[PDB]
Amino acid sequence: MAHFKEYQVIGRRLPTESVPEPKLFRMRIFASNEVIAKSRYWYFLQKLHKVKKASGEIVSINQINEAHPTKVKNFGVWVRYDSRSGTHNMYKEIRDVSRVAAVETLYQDMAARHRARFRSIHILKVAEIEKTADVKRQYVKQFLTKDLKFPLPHRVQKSTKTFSYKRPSTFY
Amino acid sequence: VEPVVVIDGKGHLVGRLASVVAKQLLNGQKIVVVRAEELNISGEFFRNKLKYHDFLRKATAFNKTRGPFHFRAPSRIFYKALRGMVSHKTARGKAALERLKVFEGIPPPYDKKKRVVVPQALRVLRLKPGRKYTTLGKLSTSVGWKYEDVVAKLEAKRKVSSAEYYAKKRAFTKKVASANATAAESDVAKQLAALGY
Amino acid sequence: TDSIVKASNWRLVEVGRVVLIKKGQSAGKLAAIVEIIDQKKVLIDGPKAGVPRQAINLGQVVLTPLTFALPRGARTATVSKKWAAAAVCEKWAASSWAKKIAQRERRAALTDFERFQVMVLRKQKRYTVKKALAKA
Amino acid sequence: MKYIQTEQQIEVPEGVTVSIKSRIVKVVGPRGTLTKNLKHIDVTFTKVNNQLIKVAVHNGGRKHVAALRTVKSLVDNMITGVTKGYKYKMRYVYAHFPINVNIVEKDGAKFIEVRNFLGDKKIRNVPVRDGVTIEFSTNVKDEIVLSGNSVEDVSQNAADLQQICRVRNKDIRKFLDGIYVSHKGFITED
Amino acid sequence: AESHRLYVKGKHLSYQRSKRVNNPNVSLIKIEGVATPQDAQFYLGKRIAYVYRASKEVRGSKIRVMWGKVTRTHGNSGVVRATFRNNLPAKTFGASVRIFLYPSNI
RNA sequence: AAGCGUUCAUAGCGACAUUGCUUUUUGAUUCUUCGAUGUCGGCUCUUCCUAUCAUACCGAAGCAGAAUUCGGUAAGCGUU
RNA sequence: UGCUCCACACAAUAUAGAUGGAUACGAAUAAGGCGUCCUUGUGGCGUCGCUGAACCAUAGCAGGCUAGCAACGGUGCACUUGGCGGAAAGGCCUUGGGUGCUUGCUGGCGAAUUGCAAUGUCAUUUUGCGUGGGGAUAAAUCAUUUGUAUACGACUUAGA
Ligand SMILES: [Mg+2]
Ligand SMILES: [Mg+2]
Ligand SMILES: [Mg+2]
Ligand SMILES: [Mg+2]
Ligand SMILES: [Mg+2]
Ligand SMILES: [Mg+2]
Ligand SMILES: [Mg+2]
Ligand SMILES: [Mg+2]
């Protein structure tokens, strides 16, 4: 469950004599590695089609890197999660430089704010919003203001030594 | 690295400073704490006064004289925090506790010795701004410590003499910095500058 | 008859603010804040000194008092052109903070002979200083 | 939530000067000097043009930006208190026993003495805090006026007198007797 | 000069131990001015003396020495594991040892 | 909260249901004690708890007063 | 021919652990320090921090002998002048003179054999002992005695 990567996993049913060349389904999977990526692919493909890992195969695994990794984007992540007493759909809006970093932020966010583990999260969709004012959350819209500036009061300075001779300051 | 390290207790969280002091004594360092009346505890005054009353009610039922001892002074409150982070029942623990002196205010000879702080334990560096805290002197007087006034009185007399001493030191370091200011641009000064000094 | 309020000047998190990386592969190099991601994370770029364009946590960098005019979201070439245009390198190098950084690096580069030379020079310099203190 | 910056304005009339260093606010105007220690709030004051003072909270939550608008009102009440002053108006409410309120000066302490409250032989004393002036307004029956420079001191004296005359062991909905505040206002409002 | 030191001061902290079982064969040593294991690699193999004194004269001197060497680093804070020819008296928990510059590679 | 309370569910109560707490009841168990822990009650004496009878200060009432009822802090002090 | 204080001579006794220096404002931290100036403020201006990675100190047979030059400083020892410090002051600031040393600069001589490393002994408590220089010349307990006390001890009294 490390620093996530996005995987382009394509799989299909095993071809038979009656119906060769099956429909060859594809999913985008956020996972720490390819082993989890294949496992997550089969899990979600169990929810949709009459298939399983024994009766199918994986034809392609491909890591998907960010097209523009070093430009800041606003992401709208649809997510379906299980709480202690029910399943809910919610929408989160995340501002960061990559889909993997946005998804990593949401896993931290859902665990912190809803105690929803990676176990009980279904990433419904990650879709970057192209235009400002189509953003819906005030906690990310406030960072899209013209000529945004802010200070960092009360800087805390770490000291290698256990004793200090100065009684330091928190200026910044 | 000093033979004796004097820690000015003001602005220090009690459990974070005493955990620092506990490791120093067990590592062989002599530690002296001053101004323990100015120590701090996270949480409201009433919350900390309630925790001391939960401590106050703990006593040996059949004889209160042989029971837990509820020391009211801030230096002894600090000492009780230290014990619990020191295996005080062993010979090594008693040797570590022999390396510590705590004081209300700054008595002699520590008045004219350099005091240090522990940024690893400072309230202004560890607490989040907007979090209520408590001063040990106010807490101690609320539970029966009898010498807040005389400590405050004798600290004022010490601070007046200390301020007068610093003025006679501000003047001397002003003259020393002026002599160093005119020493520049000489042959020796430019060689030291190229050598980082 | 005049209202007086101390402003308490702070370094601001802004586009074009020059930042010093204190932790990482750079660890002592300069960069410019290009985009503000959130309260804790900003996109920085330091192409003059070799800092790769990257999103970084504000807690592992320290803001310098230096600032220069830079558009929000500017790319690496635009930042590099306007970094040299604003002469950020020698404005940073003039600061006493950068002088002290160079003093510490030079001090750790002294050899045993060079440390001995500093000793003899310091004794020479202080002899005249003590003479100047005696007469003043 | 952690708002980036929340902002409140402070109007400064030309008659008063506001001197804020750290969080010690002093407001010197026509009527006097008022000082307030705000060293528990973590706000930032920014003077603009001798008539506008900006107060702001940087990276604050719900309970922090709520206290910011409180800081705005506290400094405004200092400004209002030193321009127009503060005046609180009582009424002596009673049914049978006439409440006899008077100003007594025992060893230079300036107490308010309240007698005959529901026939009580007890003499109720209410100290007048510094900076508050007490007047028994004429051309009106049973009224005492509390005037001063700080709304904090004037309203606390108002609550002190109102609370010293609480009815005990009776149906207070029937025994409505007591000194209550009937008007809150300024010295100069015509 | 006023300083004749040719060693680096160190403190004997404790033995190698779990929560409740120690190993007197290995001593944990804190070196002055060392804070990381990467910094503590300079002192591996260096000789450590524990210098103490006795009232009885043994071989012309009233000073006795216990010799050891740094074996490896310990933890993250620059503490080093040392092994001595005879284990430490265990009353020296918090005493001062002397870490020498030989065998010298730098 | 269906109703009672002249009208008004909740001043005071409260059906039909339902969630708990306690270990001063009695059941249920048989883990300890059968080379034995003296098995009822009272007297005497100390201490502890609060689920507060009185007392201190209060809040509510279908509290006009008097007297009551409900509720809070509270085991400091008494309870023959 | 007992006791105490000072000094130096020799023994024992040990070290919770010397190995250049514990190097002194106060307050705040959503603010401060330093310098400068004024109309003395909650003032203006400049500058600093981003750690003590500092500062001071530090060269010489474990630090010898000796010749000068520059300067009239630095620093040690005892001695002396005055003041301040009671929180546990027992320390800090000092005047003056004497006596050393000075690596601020330039010289001359010596070091070896601890043999390729062995802490290679340099510190500070305490207890005696001896020597020579001052200082003072008592009590307490038992026994007797009282009863403001008391099981016994103890307590409270009295006696040249
Ligand atoms: Mg413990
Ligand atoms: Mg007492
Ligand atoms: Mg009544
Ligand atoms: Mg270990
Ligand atoms: Mg059974
Ligand atoms: Mg028996
Ligand atoms: Mg109760
Ligand atoms: Mg020298």
The Cα A71–Cα A88 span in angstroms is: 32
Question: Residues of chain B whose C-beta is under 8 A from some C-beta in A?
Answer: 5, 7-8, 11, 20, 24, 114, 116-120, 124-125, 129
Q: Residue E66 in 3-state DSSP?
A: strand
C90 CA to centre of own chain: 10
Provide the number of CB pairs (under 8 Å) joining chain B to chain E: 16
The Cα D68–Cα D45 span in angstroms is: 11
Strand positions, DSSP E, chain C? 4-5, 12-13, 17-21, 30-36, 41-46, 51-57, 61-67
B171 plus B140 within the same structural domain: no
How far from D94 is each of D48, D99, D166, CA to CA, in Å? 52, 7, 12
Which of D86, D85, D87, D76 minimizes the C-alpha distance to D13? D76
Give the CATH number of the domain where residue E53 resides: 2.40.10.190
Nucleotide nearest to B32 (CA to C1'): G22
B17 touches B35 (CB < 8 A): no
**Longest alpha-carbon distance in chain E:** 47
B139 plus B165 within the same structural domain: no
**φ/ψ (deg, to 5) at E100:** -90, 165
> Are β-strands B100-102 and C51-57 bridged in parallel, bridged antiparallel, or unpaired?
unpaired
Q: Residue B8 in 3-state DSSP?
A: strand
- Strands in D3-11's sheet, in edge-to-edge order, are D3-11, D52-60, D44-47
Indicate yes or no: strand G within 7 A of the C-beta of A149. no
Number of domains in chain E: 1
Give the CATH number of the domain where residue C58 resides: 2.30.30.30
Compute the distance from residue D112 Cα to the ligand 5 centre, in Å: 80
The Cα C105–Cα B150 span in angstroms is: 50
**Total count of residues recorded for chain B:** 197
**Which domains does chain D possess?**
1-85 (3.90.930.12), 86-190 (3.90.930.12)
Nucleotide nearest to D172 (CA to C1'): F63
How far from D142 is each of A32, B55, E86, CA to CA, in Å? 81, 54, 98
Residue B8 CB neighbours (<10 A): 19
C interface test, pick of A97, A98, A152 with most C CB neighbours within 10 Å? A152
Give the CATH number of the domain where residue B195 resides: 1.20.5.4280
The Cα A153–Cα D4 span in angstroms is: 12
- Strands in D111-115's sheet, in edge-to-edge order, are D100-104, D111-115, D124-127
B10 plus B106 within the same structural domain: yes
A165 CA to centre of own chain: 46
Question: Residues of chain D whose C-beta is under 8 A from some C-beta in A?
Answer: 1-5, 42, 44, 58-59
Indicate yes or no: strand G within 7 A of the C-beta of E42. no
In this structure, what DSSP letter does residue B196 have? T
B45 plus B98 within the same structural domain: yes
- Residue B180 lies in domain: 148-197
Chain A residues near residue D57 by CB distance under 8 angstroms? none
The CA–C1' separation of B68 and G153, in angstroms, is 33
Nucleotide nearest to D168 (CA to C1'): F58
The Cα D21–Cα E43 span in angstroms is: 53
CA of C6, closest CA in chain A: separation in Å? 14
Q: Residue E22 in 3-state DSSP?
A: strand
The Cα A165–Cα B118 span in angstroms is: 9
Compute the distance from residue B64 Cα to the ligand 7 centre, in Å: 28
List, as ranges, residues with CB under 5 A of the ion ligand 1.
B 84
Resolution of this model in Å is: 2.4
Buried b (16+ CB within 10 A) or exposed e, B21-36: bbebbbbbbebbbbbb
Residue D60 is inside which H or E element, if any? strand D52-60
A11 touches A106 (CB < 8 A): no
Compute the distance from residue A21 Cα to the ligand 5 centre, in Å: 67
B28 plus B88 within the same structural domain: yes
In single-letter form, the type of residue at position D170 comes to K
Chain A residues near residue B125 by CB distance under 8 angstroms? 156-157, 168, 170
Strand positions, DSSP E, B15-86? 30-34, 40-42
- Residue E104 lies in domain: 1-106
Contacting subunits of D (3+ beta carbon pairs below 8 A): A, B, C
Reduced to 3 DSSP states, what percent helix, strand and coil does chain B have, rounded to the nearest 5?
A: 50, 10, 35
B28 plus B113 within the same structural domain: yes
The Cα C9–Cα E42 span in angstroms is: 44
Experimental method: cryo-EM
Q: B125 and A157: CB-CB below 8 Å? A: yes
C18 touches C88 (CB < 8 A): yes
Give the CATH number of the domain where residue B71 resides: 3.90.1180.10
Number of domains in chain B: 2
B96 plus B5 within the same structural domain: yes
The Cα C133–Cα B181 span in angstroms is: 12
- Residue C45 lies in domain: 12-94
End-to-end CA distance of chain A: 36
Residue appearing with tokens 């790319």: C75
**φ/ψ (deg, to 5) at E88:** -70, 150
Q: Residue E68 in 3-state DSSP?
A: strand
How far from A131 is each of A73, A74, C38, CA to CA, in Å? 10, 9, 18
The Cα D85–Cα D32 span in angstroms is: 10
Task: Mark which residues 35-64 of C lie under 8 Å from A by CB.
Answer: 35-39, 41, 43, 53-55, 58, 63
B136 plus B65 within the same structural domain: yes
Residue appearing with tokens 């509390």: D146
Q: What is the 3-state secondary structure (H, E, C) of D8-57?
A: EEEECCCCCEEEEECCEEEEECCCCEEEEECCCCCCEEEECCCCEEEEEE
The Cα B50–Cα B62 span in angstroms is: 25
Residue C81 CB neighbours (<10 A): 13
Q: Would an 8 Å CB–CB cutoff place C114 in contact with chain B?
A: yes
CA of B70, closest CA in chain A: separation in Å? 30
Burial of E82 per CB tally in 10 Å (0-12, 13-18, 19+): buried
Q: D58 and A151: CB-CB below 8 Å? A: yes
Compute the distance from residue C104 Cα to the ligand 8 centre, in Å: 27
B95 plus B127 within the same structural domain: yes
Burial of E35 per CB tally in 10 Å (0-12, 13-18, 19+): middle
Which of C83, C87, C89 minimizes the C-alpha distance to C32? C83
B110 plus B166 within the same structural domain: no
Angle at B130 between CA B128 and CA B134, to 5 degrees: 90
Give the CA-trace dihedral at A46, A48, A54, A57, to 10 degrees: -120
- Say if residue C47 is preceded by a cis peptide, omega within 30 of 0: no
Q: Which two tokens stand for residue D83?
A: 């321009």
Q: Residue D70 in 3-state DSSP?
A: helix
Which of E40, E51, E19, E36 minimizes the C-alpha distance to E82? E40
Residue appearing with tokens 């979201």: C73
> Are β-strands C4-5 and D17-21 bridged in parallel, bridged antiparallel, or unpaired?
parallel
B75 plus B142 within the same structural domain: yes
B64 plus B24 within the same structural domain: yes
The CA–C1' separation of D170 and F78, in angstroms, is 28
A72 touches A97 (CB < 8 A): yes
List, as ranges, residues with CB under 5 A of the ion ligand 3.
D 169
Q: Would an 8 Å CB–CB cutoff place B128 in contact with chain D?
A: no
The Cα C39–Cα D59 span in angstroms is: 8
The CA–C1' separation of E53 and G134, in angstroms, is 39
- Say if residue B109 is preceded by a cis peptide, omega within 30 of 0: yes
The Cα B37–Cα B103 span in angstroms is: 8
Residue B187 CB neighbours (<10 A): 10
Residue C34 CB neighbours (<10 A): 28
The Cα C27–Cα C60 span in angstroms is: 9
